[PDB]
Amino acid sequence: NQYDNDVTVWSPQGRIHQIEYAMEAVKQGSATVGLKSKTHAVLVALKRAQSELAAHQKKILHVDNHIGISIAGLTADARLLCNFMRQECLDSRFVFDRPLPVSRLVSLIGSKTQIPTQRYGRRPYGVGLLIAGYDDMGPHIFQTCPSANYFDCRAMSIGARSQSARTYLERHMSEFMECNLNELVKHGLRALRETLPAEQDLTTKNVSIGIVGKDLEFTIYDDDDVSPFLEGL
Amino acid sequence: GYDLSASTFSPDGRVFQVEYAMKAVENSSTAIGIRCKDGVVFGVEKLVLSKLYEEGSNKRLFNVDRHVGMAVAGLLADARSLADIAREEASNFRSNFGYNIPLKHLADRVAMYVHAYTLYSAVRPFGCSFMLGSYSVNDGAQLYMIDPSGVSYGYWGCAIGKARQAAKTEIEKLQMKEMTCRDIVKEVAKIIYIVHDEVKDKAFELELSWVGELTNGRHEIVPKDIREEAEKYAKESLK
Amino acid sequence: TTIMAVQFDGGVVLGADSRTTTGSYIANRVTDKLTPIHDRIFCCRSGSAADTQAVADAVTYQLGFHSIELNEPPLVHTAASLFKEMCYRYREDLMAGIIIAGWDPQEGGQVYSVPMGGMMVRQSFAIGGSGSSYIYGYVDATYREGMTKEECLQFTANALALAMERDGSSGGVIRLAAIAESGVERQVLLGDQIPKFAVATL
Amino acid sequence: FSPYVFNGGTILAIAGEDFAIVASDTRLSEGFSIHTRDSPKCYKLTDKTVIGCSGFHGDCLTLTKIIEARLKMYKHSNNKAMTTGAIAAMLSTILYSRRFFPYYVYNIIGGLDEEGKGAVYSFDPVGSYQRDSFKAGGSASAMLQPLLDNQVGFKNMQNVEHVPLSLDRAMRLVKDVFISAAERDVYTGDALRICIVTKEGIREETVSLRKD
Amino acid sequence: SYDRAITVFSPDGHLFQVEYAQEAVKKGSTAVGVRGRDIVVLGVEKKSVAKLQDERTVRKICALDDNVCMAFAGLTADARIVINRARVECQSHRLTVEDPVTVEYITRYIASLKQRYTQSNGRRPFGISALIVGFDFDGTPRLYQTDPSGTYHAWKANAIGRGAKSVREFLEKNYTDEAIETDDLTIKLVIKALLEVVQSGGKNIELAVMRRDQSLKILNPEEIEKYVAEIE
Amino acid sequence: DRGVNTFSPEGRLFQVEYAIEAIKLGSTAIGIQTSEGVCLAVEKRITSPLMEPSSIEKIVEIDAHIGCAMSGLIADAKTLIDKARVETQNHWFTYNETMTVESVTQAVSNLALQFGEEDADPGAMSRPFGVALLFGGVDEKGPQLFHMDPSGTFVQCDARAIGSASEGAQSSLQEVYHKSMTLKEAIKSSLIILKQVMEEKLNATNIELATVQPGQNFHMFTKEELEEVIKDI
Amino acid sequence: TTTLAFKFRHGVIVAADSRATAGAYIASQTVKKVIEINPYLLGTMAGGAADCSFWERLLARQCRIYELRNKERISVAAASKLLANMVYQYKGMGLSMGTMICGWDKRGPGLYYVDSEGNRISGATFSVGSGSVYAYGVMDRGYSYDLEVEQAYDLARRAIYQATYRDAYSGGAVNLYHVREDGWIRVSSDNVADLHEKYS
Amino acid sequence: MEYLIGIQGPDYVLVASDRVAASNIVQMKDDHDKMFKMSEKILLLCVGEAGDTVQFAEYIQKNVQLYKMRNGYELSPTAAANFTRRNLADCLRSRTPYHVNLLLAGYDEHEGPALYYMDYLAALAKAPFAAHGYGAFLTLSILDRYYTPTISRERAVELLRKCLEELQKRFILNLPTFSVRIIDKNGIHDLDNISF
Amino acid sequence: TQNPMVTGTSVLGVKFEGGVVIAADMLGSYGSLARFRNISRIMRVNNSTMLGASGDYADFQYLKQVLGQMVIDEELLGDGHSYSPRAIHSWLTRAMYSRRSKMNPLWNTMVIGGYADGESFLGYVDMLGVAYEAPSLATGYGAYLAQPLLREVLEKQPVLSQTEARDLVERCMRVLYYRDARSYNRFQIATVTEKGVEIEGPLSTETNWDIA
């Protein structure tokens, strides 16, 4: 009641309702899937068209040659975080001439996203992100939350009807490690499909694919480039 | 309406925003810390919510310095923030005085930053309690716990989280002053397993760290082999 | 100015001339260049009087707060480090050569030379000032490991006397101090007490 | 204290109907000493653009890393790689940003244009750039420019067929002009990095010059 | 610095603080402006004559520059702040461009300021609407209106303040090439428009005219009475 | 009670959702993208005969290749159209090239959500912008039309109607739009749908139409050219 | 550098050389020292190459923002004052820029000279550069407001040619532009080598 | 350098200025105007460093014009002279000083005609007649020898001519034309340029 | 530092098969006076990188504390990533340039030697931000007395063993003692290999011959 309009007010039960509310925004976004093999980390995003005459929106973004992000929630807040991530990666390659470890970038985002959750007049970030990157520690899939908490994931799905995807991923996660890129990409596409309004299919217009690996810089496959991956399901 | 800001005392002399912040720490899994003669062993019941989470996600044992380790409970985002503060306080002490910061000084300085979040309405009290532990030849083993209010005290065995009281009964049945780290690690695992409630809390990964004469005054994660022997002893003891 | 400090098994002996100078004028002929930063930590100041007095006052303040907060006697290295921090940070606005020597319960008697520029180095014996140059060969020829407080006090008195007789910017009385766990014993050598060396005749 | 130091270096770029050659000597120096004999002054910026930078090595290192970041920032906001003409314009703004503490660097951008043809741009240490067909910069610029002007521009030559420049004729000119520079410039003469930009990518060849 | 959001959206997409500002303009005196062929006329209702009040100090018609002049309805104190900002702006324009500001240039600036006060922290919208009237260098008579929202439009004739709707309805049916051919006919159009709202008639009606290449002229009370009788 | 940046229990941000309702009260503006170019049409919504219809500017030029149709609080748009024009000229000065329409739409959409009262800045915006924009232009990708909303979200739309009658013109738009449609057919389709939604009788003075074509620059149709199309309408 | 501009009955004639020099080294003989701010306004550059090119381009950016916001093309006077005010902020700092703003406005043909020193003067005939002294003589002895278009073209080419013959830092080709009421036209780019044969 | 002259009479103030703008050894303009209309009865004649004269003069002009708009009346010659002096004196010890020598001339319907001399240091002096420039050295004595407080506007133009003829004979700089204006109850009046 | 104070002399470096070796004298001079004669101008940044410094010793003492914390900060994360010898060299170039541009330089010429991924790293960084990598490095008067000898041997035999590298370093240290008036006969030799960085104590070129 009077404990759910500011992020600086603990509820009598030790809960900030404003962070819980911001976390609802991501659950109100198109489902995005992310899985990793032993060599590749793939991000599958279900783009959503506002109308039959409107492009979907662009849910997958480039941060650096080794990192890419899938978005769920407010796109404006996603762009603001994407820019912070892009600059932090540029700063790392300018000072140490080395790609920024993916794990370290996630630590920086959680620090930047926690500050607004403890200051009066400031709102939690309303974007959930699935980060895919490759490093000297192999392929990595991370999920960030508006609460400022992040998780190293073997596979994850953030967005609307994403539990259907997380059910598929939990069942098939055992075989993902030893999987070819196309087998891995098709596993992700199958899970993203499990999050589709019953009577709906994964066309080349409603799907996007981002991939990064030992020899592949983050690439966003869209339109016809997704046809190779979709053909075979 | 006396409980909406930390800049307000109730008609009874209590700041309920700080009491509410510590309710968050009591809704977290337990993190136990036991001081022996050889150093300090930290143990945490890290509940794994999703099986799609890699091992080591949401770790609650941090290295705040070469000699200091931090166990945490409550909001992990707030806890990670205070680990950054502790890491920065230790760094500036070494750059200004030129030596490893004493754990009492590190505890006192971090506790003051926590207490500064319990006086104004422009900020909310931190929703996390932590235990800082270290071991030096001159100072010996030290265990300090800090609460959301900003109170710091040194203990021989502390327990923060949802099962602090039950964990304390078990820790109080131990002669830590005479025991060594190698023997304490198994006891920490035994208590975390005995306090864990599988019926409600689903599954958990035992996280174990230590600093002592064996680690040569360096905070580190208990070697996988020693952790596995401890977990086998823990499960066997529960029988 | 001639400042000198030596370590012995249990403490440190410190020494200094007593001459302040504006050009060739002696503004003070009885100056105390041996300043106490804490109970058993003293400093031997050389260079600018205003710069050295300001930095020593600042370090005593910072060291005092640190000791009351960390309820423990201060380490000689900490005082040397705080002196180094300021003298390096303001190396371009500060002319100050300092020797931080004192006794701590953990590392014993320690002599640290924080020279001009902001550098810090531990030394068995340290010398500093304009008169330091004339006694480099002497200290290198007369210093022996295993000396005592009495032998160390004579080394400092003999060396300062030779430098005070050759440096115009050095002279007056020889102020000596011995710091050990027991306390700090201070001594002033004046007149015939100051060691003498025969001149030639040809 | 002086913030700058001449590290030596000669850069050359020649444009063709379907190619652009960016070439450089490989010897960093200071005073009468050689720092290294393998310090190429050519830097690939894109698959169709190479920059050559000579002067104060400290500034060339900083400017090259600044451009690499500015190119990535453009690709992230514009979703495309910058064209050779776009980098030439941005470099002018970057160099002028430091007009009161300038970069002691002489840069020559050589690449293929949006039409697939060679394009060379020369820059002064403060930003002034020019689309040129061939430009030599660095320690031995005044030793290499007067000949490209005659052999490539056919200047001061009467009754001579103005044949187009082949990569074959252009590469012999680049090697020959640098061999002569190695003979009379004390700051040039370790080896010659030659980067040739074509629609098939950027190929890099290294010949050898005279070690003093 | 006080940085609270005074102007914020409301369910239904309504900035009530801006709507409250327009309510203050509706409580203001009626200001009428008719754009003629060679004369722009601005007339304001002198609510109460006061009798013991110097009129030179309560004039609601001012000159932002040699070519521009404005009338206002709403808060007189907020207006003085806006008039001074626009006067300083006209001079800054002459210094950076070496030419007289255009009527719409100053209307755009006054509107942009009136708008920033509706989307800036710690500020309340200005409770005033203005009628900027002047002649562009080309010699085109110009009439513009500004709202407390920062919205501005050009008009052939308009009315602001109390009884604006009634006066504008009148000008809507009485504005024509006929009632604008003569400078006197333009002046009597503004006079009749105000007389529809003004009860006293003549005694309580200030009026000003700015012919081309001429300064703002404040018609004397006797001259106003001449037209008021002819318009009767 | 609630500050500008408070999330709803549904995680939506109240100030951003009340600014969208503010647009639903604006003059309908239609945008159609064809291979032969982009047409932008808007309803002037004149209030009185004494008003000068030319003073109502709902279609503006950001650059020779980019035009914009606005609906909602027009005064709020002025600052957004100023950013677009300066960003285009800054891109020219820095890279000597025309800015893409997506880059201009992304630059303006970034200013949205940049509001707050927690000392965010000395000249920080207090509330969201209550305006929706239809950017139409021709880049290296061809005729392009993007739509931006007060949420900071921008989308590529083939045909889009913003304003009060969007929930009706969009249905009519999705019934008459074909990728092969010509610019002339699109221009006629815009006026027909506008005449239907417009409360007043569409004439050459109560509507504004402009077009960006591959070779020609942004062109605002004059009464004479508007009259010709309205004759067929 | 040799840049001259004169206003006559048929418009304003702008001509310039093409040589850029680092020390005594002739770096370029093909530099464009006439910038086109708009289809009706052109600015010439003398002095520092980078300085003039940067500020004249920043002028073009500001002039275009004016057209978009004011829905009208800027005057030659407003453009001249903008550059003058932009450079006065850096007076006594090193900028070396001698410029002439030339265009057709609502007040007719316009010619203003702006220096980084702070000088902003309108006029009928101006010459800026190191060869300005040599150009003034030929231009002054042959100038007439009632000069026919072809004669005005010939006078400008001859004055730049004579400046390039006496000035070491002046050379290359003569780039001629004619500003008329419908905008400017680039009339020719004659090399001083070919001009030397004709004028001799 | 540039030449400024002012002669105050019983009911008028006559001012003249050279009309030449020079680059280095070349006159780039012979129709320059160094007089600025601050008000309908106030003129500021300014000479000095390039860029500093118009930047300071245009600033003082727009501020005096803002006064008339803000208050409905104009600043008096004395108030304008003092406002100018404060601004020139308040930028002297600043990092952006204006090197400008000025001559304010105006007519107050009450205090009458006034001519004010100001140097770059900002020292204000009211003078019956004053001049600025190296030519002042060769002309101030001609004014001292012939100036009488009751000089007529006709005899004032004749003395102005004597001073400018002296510049043509003894001065080493080609100052051929002079802008001549007069101020009185009826305002500022442009008179024929004295050319040689 | 605008005015260097207690300074160190030449630092040598040579890459061999399996790692790199750096050598520096244990002396800090106060303008001709050998004042501090038992100081180490070599540092173990991490297990794969070592750093030798010439110039102001207080500026080196500042770098040892800043780089020392930077390594402690990384080793507290437990991420499995560490600063490589090349990353430490990039940071030092960025630091020296940043200070030189502010006109407050760190009067220090550093030699960074490292071993990672079976690759030997040897990088040079000056106070103006000039940096390069090379098979051998010699700062100070070693640039004129030691580098010539090292470069001759590394030209005939491009790849040296650890035994050969140490022999040549000890030979170049003797020539630096015979002809550098700011040198000292006590030196430390640091070796980076797959085992980590090892620093040898006070070694002497006492193998000096004086046939006068």
Ligand SMILES: CC(C)C[C@@H](C=O)NC(=O)[C@H](CC(C)C)NC(=O)[C@H](CC(C)C)NC(=O)OCc1ccccc1
């Ligand atoms: C550090 C103290 C122990 C002083 C000690 C130096 O080592 N003895 C000294 O003789 C030094 C010599 C120094 C210039 C090298 N003397 C000084 O530094 C003198 C001391 C003043 C009180 C007169 N300072 C000085 O010369 O400038 C301060 C000053 C200011 C006004 C008038 C005269 C002198």
Ligand SMILES: CC(C)C[C@@H](C=O)NC(=O)[C@H](CC(C)C)NC(=O)[C@H](CC(C)C)NC(=O)OCc1ccccc1
């Ligand atoms: C606009 C200029 C080209 C006019 C000309 C003189 O007025 N400027 C110059 O001649 C300048 C300066 C000179 C006076 C010493 N000469 C120059 O060499 C300057 C920069 C050097 C001084 C580092 N400009 C330069 O080298 O390149 C200019 C350029 C611009 C476009 C294409 C080709 C060349």
